[PDB]
Amino acid sequence: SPEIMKDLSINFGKALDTCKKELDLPDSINEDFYKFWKEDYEITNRLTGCAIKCLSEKLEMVDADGKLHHGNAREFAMKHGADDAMAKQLVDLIHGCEKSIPPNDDRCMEVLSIAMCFKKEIHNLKWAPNMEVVVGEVLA
Ligand SMILES: CC/C=C\C=C/CCCCCCCCCC=O
């Protein structure tokens, strides 16, 4: 549902300022986060990809081979309201995106591609929250 996806979004973005400081990222990535869930908005900046990668790593969502860690993704989803079914459905969407995306040597671009594919799948399910919820109050 959009309500669960809002909560997952807020919690995924809570480390954004921490990741920006660790990576010395520029403020020109901020608008991409404010617009993350805006339908048809494409993020193209690889630096925003690096940030998304870091946010995933903060939640232990990347396994030792650079692919989704299903168990930790499931645990994250379920803490914030997903039942086992929704958790599985979310993980399957991300896995499906990993397998469909044009492959990329650059992890920041790979992550970006997976995020954009995932976003489109969530819109297709009518589960997208408001556009700006990943940021929450983290940049205020
Ligand atoms: C688990 C996500 C649920 C709600 C909102 C945002 C999640 C961020 C979507 C990006 C997915 C990152 C997967 C690629 C990680 C690099 O291997």
Author numbering: 1 to 140
Could you share sentences copied from the article?
A primary pheromone-binding protein (PBP) from A. transitella, (AtraPBP1) has been identified based on its expression profile in male antennae and its biochemical properties. Understanding the structural basis of pheromone detection and elucidating the mechanisms of action of olfactory proteins will aid in the development of novel and stable mimics of one or more of the attractants. These pathways are mediated in part by pheromone-binding proteins (PBPs), which are believe to be important in solubilizing the hydrophobic ligands and serve as an initial transporter that present odorants to a receptor in the membrane to elicit an olfactory response. To answer these questions and to pave the way for the design of a stable synthetic sex pheromone useful as a mating disruptor, we solved the high-resolution crystal structures at high pH of the liganded AtraPBP1 complexed separately with the major constituent of the sex pheromone of A. transitella, (11Z,13Z)-hexadecadienal (Z11Z13-16Ald) and the secondary constituent, (11Z,13Z)-hexadecadienol (Z11Z13-16OH). The pH 6.5 AtraPBP1 structure complexed with either Z11Z13-16OH or Z11Z13-16Ald adopts the same core canonical fold described previously for pheromone-binding proteins consisting of six α-helices connected by loops.
The binding site is highly complementary to these linear molecules in this particular conformation and is unlikely to be capable of binding molecules, which are longer or significantly diverge in shape. Both pheromones are firmly stabilized into the binding pocket primarily by an array of hydrophobic interactions. The hydrophobic interactions are mediated by the side-chains of Leu8, Ile52, Met61, Leu68, Ileu94, Val111 and Ile114 that make numerous interactions with the carbon chain. In addition, a stacked arrangement of a quartet of phenylalanines at positions 12, 36, 76 and 118 interact with the ligands near the desaturated carbons. In the case of the Z11Z13-16Ald pheromone constituent, the oxygen of the aldehyde group is hydrogen-bonded to the positively charged Arg107 guanidinium group. In addition, two water-mediated hydrogen bonds with the backbone oxygen of both Met61 and Gly66 complete the binding mesh of Z11Z13-16Ald in AtraPBP1. Accordingly, they are both almost completely sequestered from the solvent by the protein (2.7% and 2.2% solvent accessibility for the alcohol and aldehyde forms respectively). The average B-factor for both structures is relatively low with 18.2 Å2 (holo Z11Z13-16Ald) and 13.0 Å2 (holo Z11Z13-16OH) respectively. Possible x-ray radiation-induced damage was found in the Z11Z13-16Ald bound structure at the early stages of the refinement consisting of an unambiguous, discontinuous 2Fo-Fc electron density at 1.14 Å resolution located where the disulfide bond between Cys19 and Cys54 should be. The same bond was found intact on the refined structure from a preliminary dataset collected on a home source at 1.54 Å using the same crystal (data not shown).
